[PDB]
Structure formats: structure tokens, C-alpha cells
């Protein structure tokens, strides 16, 4: 089911929607492309223009909010697109960061239309898109040199994981008194810029985190209980041939998709020992 030649420039991201049917792609041509997918056939629905720089990442909102899509770019902005009345249009613009916006992710539907946004200015912002038009973005200094990736924990208590160019991995928790996301834990282990962090949706009694870096190592991080120690586990003892860019968790199974600069995809599962083997 290959959708060959989607863009004429290098593609940076491709994500399916909540149903696993509708595809959203973004590239250096500064545009988003939306594809309907069925059998071995694809159909280009629209092209979404507005970004003034390469589009880095995209994410689909839960359908219960409507057919929404957030995108982020080098231009320093997050653009929100909807498919209402059979056509696609830009409805919102989040322009709070003073540098490239590297990562964009929708919260668990439980919380609402919250958007997690990581940037090269070292700020990480949180944006609820209110039904009254206005927004009140919560903003935090998260990382030195810049933030590269931010992911939500699953719905329980509100948590997300950030990856930065300061080599660190950080877990933030919302607080009522501080009215913001305070730091819960700094996770150390990476010798170079972190590119992607990913929290597993696993509903089990253990929490799984997957960091990925320019140092060409993947580290799984595990937590057996609320509060207490995060355990560093190196996916494999030898380094990967090239810089790792992405990690992705299966919706159930706790399987791990790993993307490298060698253009190779590697799937990993957890054995009895607590170590990781191919899947």
C-alpha cells in the first residue's frame, strides 16, 4: 500500500488518523497533503498551504472534536486545519515561539483539545483551543539549546515527556497551585541531542518511555509505580549505524517502531529478562 510520489520535496512526516484511514503528510515544500486510503489505492484530497518554512510534524485530533489537524514548522508557527463543510481550511494559528517548532501532539481526548508544542527556543507551550475563539497558552522553559520532542502520557494526573538538545529527558506534571507543568524528573543517559521521546499508551501497571538521540542509542525508561525510580534500559548494547530520529509505540502490545538515518525500520519487543529483542 505504497503512496509513491506524494511530494516533490523530501517528506518529514506521515501520520494516519484515529481510524487508520486518512493520511496526513508534510514536507520541505512548506505544504501538508491529505490522502484518503482504502485498498491499494490512494486519492489526494487537498493541499494545505500557509507555512513559510519546511513542515516538520503533524497530528490528528480525536474525531469527537471534529476533523482537526495540527501542523508545525521551521517558520515558528503551529497551524490548525479542519475538514468542515467538505473543504479544508486553516482555522487557528499558534505563534508564540521565537524559533523552529519541532513537535506537535494532541492530548488524550479526556483532557480536551489540548496541544503539546515543543520548540527550538527552548520553550514548550500548552494550548487549549477554546470554543469561544480565544486561547490562553501555558508556556514553560523546558530545555537548554532547544526542545526537539514532546509526548503525552496516557490518561489516568496530567503528564508529558520532553526531549532536548541539552541531552536530557524530562517529565512534567500539572500542578493546581503553580497553575502549570512543574518538573517531576530529569532523566539522564544520552550523550547528544535527543530527537524523539515517546510514552507508551500501555494501560498496564508499568509505564514505558522511549528516548532516541543523535548519540545513536535508544533508551527505554520504565516506572513500576506512581512516584519512585525511572529505570534506564538501553535497547541494545551496540550503537545504531546512524542517528535515530523516531520512536513509536503500538496501541496495544507495547511494540516499538524505531526510525534511523540509515533509512531502516526496526521493531522491538520485551523479553522475560526485561531486555529487548526484535519483533
Amino acid at each position: 500500500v505504497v503512496i509513491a510520489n506524494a511530494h516533490n520535496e523530501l517528506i518529514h512526516d506521515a501520520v494516519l488518523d484515529y481510524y487508520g484511514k486518512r493520511l496526513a503528510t508534510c514536507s520541505s515544500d512548506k505544504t501538508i497533503k491529505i490522502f484518503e486510503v482504502e485498498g491499494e489505492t490512494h486519492k489526494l484530497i487537498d493541499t494545505l498551504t500557509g507555512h513559510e518554512g519546511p513542515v516538520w510534524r503533524v497530528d490528528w485530533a480525536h474525531p469527537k472534536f471534529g476533523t482537526i489537524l495540527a501542523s508545525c514548522s521551521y517558520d515558528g508557527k503551529v497551524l490548525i486545519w479542519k475538514e468542515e463543510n467538505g473543504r479544508w481550511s486553516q482555522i487557528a494559528v499558534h505563534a508564540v515561539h521565537s524559533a523552529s517548532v519541532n513537535s506537535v501532539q494532541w492530548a488524550p481526548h479526556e483532557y480536551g483539545p489540548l496541544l503539546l508544542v515543543a520548540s527550538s527556543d527552548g520553550k514548550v507551550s500548552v494550548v487549549e483551543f477554546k470554543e469561544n475563539g480565544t486561547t490562553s497558552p501555558i508556556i514553560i522553559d523546558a530545555h537548554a539549546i532547544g526542545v526537539n520532542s514532546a509526548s503525552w502520557a496516557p490518561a489516568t494526573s496530567r503528564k508529558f515527556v520532553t526531549g532536548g538538545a541539552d541531552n536530557l529527558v524530562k517529565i512534567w506534571k500539572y500542578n493546581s497551585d503553580a497553575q502549570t507543568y512543574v518538573l517531576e524528573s530529569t532523566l539522564e543517559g544520552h550523550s547528544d541531542w535527543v530527537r524523539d521521546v515517546a510514552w507508551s499508551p500501555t494501560v498496564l501497571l508499568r509505564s514505558y518511555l522511549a528516548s532516541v538521540s543523535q548519540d545513536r542509542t535508544c533508551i527505554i525508561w520504565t516506572q513500576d509505580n506512581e512516584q519512585g525510580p525511572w529505570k534506564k534500559t538501553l535497547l541494545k548494547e551496540e550503537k545504531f549505524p546512524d542517528v535515530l530520529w523516531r520512536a513509536s509505540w503500538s496501541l496495544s502490545g507495547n511494540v516499538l517502531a524505531l526510525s534511523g538515518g540509515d533509512n531502516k525500520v526496526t521493531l522491538w519487543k520485551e523479553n522475560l529478562e526485561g531486555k529487548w529483542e526484535p519483533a
Binding site: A4, V243, L258, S259, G260
Partner: protein, 329 residues
């Protein structure tokens, strides 16, 4: 820093894995076959074909503990035999005696429930069983057992025997003779429509009272049974003593005789009117002696009326009938 070739793989709903193609200008979407995660082939098939045998086989091997083993053994039993055939097999049967009666009641076999009770001296409960039977034959055997043990003890127990088996014969003979008024009524209820058998028992009870010195009570029953012969017997027995009580009362031998016959006759004749239905040999003789008194008075009309009350079988009665016939006319 920014913008580099990357497969950018995302998992998506339904085991899908999205990735950018190696050229960096396309997209790939596949369904990776994960190691320890499969499509349940047997369950999807067993749910549509309704054939759980394959599934039972699978799960019979993959068994964890003992409890789980019996559960899947049960499902095999439910699969082969059937849900109806298993409940019959599982709700079936094999101080054991008392349990056997319990088996009989629950399984609707009332028939043997009584005999089991009676054979083991559980008489109280044998009655409670039969009290709802309404079958007959059985109800009698429960009574038989009761009368076999408590039957001929007290008075009341003997009354009950006669009402149940409907026989006064035992009651007439053995029951407290002062309780004769009970025995008298039990005759009126056992034979409301059997004149012959009613009288036979009233006499038997009347006979027994006389036998036990109850003269005034005994007569009442002879009157009720309509028998002169039996009353006459009580009155002929008292006769010679009654003849001697006139002799002592300043009367001649003949005067005593001539009045003690008349008195006797007068009495019997008044009693004879209030009765329904005479071959007592002794009574015949007193009647004939009175005939001779009657004819000596000249009164042939009375003599003939008394001769007609007797059977015309006797040779003297026959000749006294003739003698009066020729005398008068």
C-alpha cells in the same frame, strides 16, 4: 539540527505501520506481523461455524491449574453430550434409610415412601406422606400399621378401628360395655341401608348387656332391633321369681298363677304393638296356658285372636284352633 531523511514511522489503529519511503518523497503503510501477537483464527472461526471442539482441544492442552482443568473438562462434556444431557447426568442419584424416603418424595415415588417408612417404624411421617396421596390402597396400609400397634388398647383407638375398616363386630364384643351408646350409634351409621345386618348387631350388643347385667339397657336395643323373641327371653327368665312374689302377697296357688300369666301376657301384648316383625318354644307354651284360661272364661273371641299370633305348625296349636272353632260356632 533540522530536516533529515527519516522513516518517521507511526503506529496506527489496526496494527498499521506508516512510514516514509526510502526515496523520501512517498509513504508506505503496512500491517506488520508481530511476534507474540496474532489474529485469533480459531475464535473467529468457532464463533461463526459454532464449532467449539477445535477450541476445546487447544485450551485442553494450554491448561494452567486444576480448577481451570475441570472448567475446560466441563466444556468438553457440554460440547459432546449437550447442555440437557449433562444436567440429567449431574443432578442424578447413586442414616441411609431416612435418606431413601427423602429420595422417594423428591422423585415423586410416594408409593415406596410409605412402605420404607412403615418398615422402619417411622409411622408419624408415613401418615404425613399419605395425607396428600389421595390414591387409596396406600392410605389403608398406613392405618393397618397404626391399628397393628395402637389398635385394641384404649377405647378411642378401638372406635377408630371400627370407623376405618367399617366393622362393628369387634366393637360390639370388646369395647367398654358402659360405652354402649357409642356402639349403638355406630350400628346406625354402618348400616343406614341394610335392615338385616343392623338388627343382627343391635341384638348382639343387647345380648352382651344382658350377659353383663344391664337389663334396662339391653331391652332398649331389642326394641330398636324389633325382636319379641329376645325381650321374651328376659321376661320368661324373671317369670318363676315373679310368680313367687304374688304367692307371698297373700294369694292362693291358682290365683298367683292365673294373674302372673295375665300380667305377663298383658305386658307383652302392649309391647307387641310398638314393634315391627315368633317361634320361642317357651313363649308359645305360656300363650297356650293363657288360651286355656281365656276359654274357661267363655271368651272364645279373644282366644282365637291369640291363637292367630302363633305359628300353625304345632299340633296342639292346630287342635286348639279347631276346638275353639267348633266350640264357638
Amino acid at each position: 539540527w533540522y530536516g533529515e531523511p527519516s522513516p518517521a514511522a507511526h503506529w496506527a489503529f489496526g496494527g498499521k505501520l506508516v512510514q516514509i519511503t526510502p526515496d523520501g518523497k512517498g509513504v508506505s503503510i503496512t500491517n506488520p506481523k508481530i511476534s507474540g501477537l496474532e489474529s485469533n483464527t480459531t475464535l473467529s472461526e468457532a464463533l461463526k461455524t459454532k464449532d467449539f471442539k477445535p477450541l476445546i482441544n487447544q485450551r485442553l492442552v494450554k491448561v494452567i491449574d486444576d480448577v481451570n482443568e475441570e472448567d475446560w473438562n466441563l466444556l468438553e462434556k457440554l460440547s459432546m453430550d449437550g447442555t440437557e444431557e449433562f444436567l440429567k447426568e449431574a443432578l442424578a442419584f447413586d442414616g441411609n434409610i431416612e435418606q431413601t424416603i427423602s429420595k422417594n418424595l423428591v422423585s415423586g415415588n410416594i408409593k415406596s415412601a410409605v412402605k420404607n417408612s412403615l418398615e422402619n417404624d417411622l409411622l408419624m411421617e408415613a401418615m404425613v406422606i399419605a395425607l396428600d396421596s389421595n390414591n387409596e390402597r396406600l392410605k389403608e396400609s398406613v392405618k393397618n400399621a397404626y391399628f397393628a400397634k395402637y389398635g385394641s388398647k384404649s377405647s378411642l383407638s378401638r372406635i377408630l378401628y371400627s370407623i376405618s375398616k367399617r366393622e362393628v363386630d369387634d366393637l360390639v364384643e370388646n369395647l367398654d360395655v358402659s360405652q354402649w351408646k357409642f356402639i349403638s350409634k355406630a350400628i346406625q351409621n354402618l348400616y343406614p341401608n341394610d335392615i338385616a345386618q343392623r338388627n343382627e348387631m343391635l341384638i348382639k350388643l343387647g345380648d352382651r348387656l344382658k350377659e353383663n347385667g344391664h337389663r334396662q339397657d339391653s331391652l332398649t336395643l331389642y326394641l330398636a332391633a324389633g325382636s319379641l323373641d329376645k325381650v321374651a327371653s328376659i321376661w320368661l327368665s324373671e317369670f318363676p321369681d315373679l310368680e313367687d312374689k304374688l304367692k307371698k302377697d297373700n294369694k292362693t296357688i291358682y290365683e298367683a298363677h292365673s294373674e302372673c300369666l295375665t300380667e305377663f301376657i298383658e305386658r307383652f301384648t302392649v309391647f307387641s304393638n310398638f314393634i315391627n316383625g315368633i317361634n320361642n318354644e317357651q313363649l308359645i307354651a305360656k300363650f297356650l296356658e293363657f288360651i286355656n284360661l281365656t276359654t274357661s272364661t267363655g271368651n272364645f273371641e279373644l282366644a282365637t285372636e291369640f291363637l292367630n299370633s302363633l305359628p300353625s305348625d304345632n299340633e296342639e296349636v292346630k287342635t286348639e284352633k279347631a276346638r275353639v272353632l267348633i266350640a264357638s260356632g
